[PDB]
Amino acid sequence: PPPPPVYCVCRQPYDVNRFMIECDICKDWFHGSCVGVEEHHAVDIDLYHCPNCAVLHGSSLMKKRRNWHRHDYTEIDDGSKPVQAGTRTFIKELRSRVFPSADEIIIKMHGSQLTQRYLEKHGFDVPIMVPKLDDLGLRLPSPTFSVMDVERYVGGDKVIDVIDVARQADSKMTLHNYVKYFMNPNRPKVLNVISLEFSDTKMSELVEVPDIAKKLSWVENYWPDDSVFPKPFVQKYCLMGVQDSYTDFHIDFGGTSVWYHVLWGEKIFYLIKPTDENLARYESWSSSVTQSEVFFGDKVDKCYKCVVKQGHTLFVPTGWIHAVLTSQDCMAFGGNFLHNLNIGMQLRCYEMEKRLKTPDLFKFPFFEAICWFVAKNLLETLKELREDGFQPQTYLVQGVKALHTALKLWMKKELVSEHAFEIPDNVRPGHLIKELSKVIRAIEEEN
């Protein structure tokens, strides 16, 4: 009668859902949580020694650093192989690079001027900087709010996604362990936390997104509360990163627009305009084999450097390509949102993600689902407008049009089989597309 199979110091049966590491001495497996080993520490450990074996054999044999410019710091430091994104060398070169200032393109405003009316008239296609919090409708915890407070409200046991910046790889850690790492001024490595959405926590109550984001948001205006699909929550993110954290050039999921507020620290955004040329080069680079070794800021004509100091708020429009460097230990708040000002661009970005085979976890939850809802709503808003002697605004027309082309396409015989589980259970696809084309045709005639 053999003894039931158990592992680790806790002598528990295997649990394929928990992170484990193997002792090179006893050949047993251990829960990282039981022996104090984080998922990100695994790659640094060559041959692991559990606490028990270490007493007579010493601590784990760690891998040896031979360079400062590659994701694999063990590689010999000769001359072959270029500098990779996120490494110490990369950061040193980035800090000394010369960029045109973002002052050349962004718009500095007062919160009271940033309205829907203002964006419909001047458009929302260049980053907007709002230095003072006044009139934005943005509520945040006081400037004294610290990472320890985040733990206090969110709870130390929550599992968050962390990024090992020098490897440009991610893993999971408890908030408790992350705050513990952040509080020690002596960091063994650079770790960044960029996707801690807290709408579902006690912390959600301390934040109220900017009025302008709430006013324009698709989810805020067109997503039915009674829908069967789980409402997408990408409205409240808490960002924590130590000095030298770095996120490479990308375009927000679903072509969303974003707002960022630095509570303390300093962040530097490298902005690239979404011209057709830039978007093309971006998709090439994004899918290239040498991506990690090419600074995208060198593949375009202008890469603007935007310093966002604590207390400031930045809004970045649809499709803009940007990278971010954490200049100082930083805590920030931000959120994403879709709107009617640049539907075409939003759809363009969605399609690019499909081609690039972007993982489901890195996209706007129910993008097509919300696109149907919006179309259904805009059809009515368009009728009512004409049924009152009014000429719909050009951008809205061009937008609803772009949405028409997209919708029609998602139904094509060969395609329809995919964008199926996405179509909300209360809209008539064909009917909708038809009623749309009709109204578009009218405005395109009686105007």
Ligand X SMILES: O=C(O)CNC(=O)C(=O)O
The CB density around residue 169, as the number of other CB atoms within 10 Å, is 13
Does residue 247 interact with ligand X by CB under 6 A?
Answer: yes
Shortest separation between residue 324's beta carbon and ligand X, angstroms: 4
Confirm or deny that 115 is annotated as ligand binding: no
**Nearest in space to 367 (alpha carbons), one of 401, 410, 398:** 410
Nearer CB in complex with Zn ion: 34/105: 34
| Contact call for residues 246 and 219 (beta carbons, < 8 A) | no
Residue 354, annotated as binding a ligand: no
Report the alpha-carbon distance of residue 392 to residue 333 in Å, rounded.
35
250 is in an annotated binding site: yes
Judged by CB under 5 A, the stretch of 114-122, 193-201, 244-252, 347-355 that binds Fe ion is 244-252
In this chain, which stretch among 54-62, 92-100, 176-184, 239-247 interacts with ligand X, using CB under 6 A?
239-247
Q: Which region, judged by CB under 5 A, interacts with Zn ion, from 51-59, 161-169, 241-249, 350-358?
A: 51-59
- The contact mask relative to Fe ion for 24-63 (x = CB under 5 A, - = no) is x----------------------x----------------
313, 326, 327, 340: which one contacts ligand X (CB under 6 A)?
Answer: 326
Partner from ligand X, Fe ion, Zn ion, none contacting 47, C-beta within 5 to 8 A by type: Fe ion
Contact (Cβ atoms closer than 8 angstroms) between residue 21 and residue 9: no
Tell me: does residue 267 bind ligand X (CB under 6 A): yes
| Collapsed DSSP state (helix, strand, coil) of residue 126 | coil
Question: Can you tell me which residue has the tokens 């952040």?
Answer: 182
* Total residues binding Zn ion (CB under 5 A): 9
Token readout for 430 is 């064909």
Would you say 25 and 2 are in contact if contact means Cβ atoms under 8 Å apart?
no
What's the burial of 422, exposed, middle or buried (CB within 10 Å: 0-12/13-18/19+)?
middle
Question: Phi/psi of residue 182, each to 5°?
Answer: -70, -35
Q: Which is nearer to ligand X, 334 or 392 (CB)?
A: 334
* Distance, CA of 231 to CA of 365 (rounded, Å): 8
Extended beta strands in 12-158, E state: 20-22, 29-31, 45-47, 61-62, 107-108, 128-130
Q: Which is nearer to Zn ion, 4 or 389 (CB)?
A: 4
**Using CB under 6 A as the criterion, which residues of the chain lie in contact with ligand X when the complex forms?**
194, 239, 241, 247, 252, 267, 324, 326
**Using CB under 5 A as the criterion, which residues of the chain lie in contact with Zn ion when the complex forms?**
8, 10, 23, 25-26, 31, 34, 50, 53
- Which residues line the annotated binding site for Fe cation? 250, 252, 322
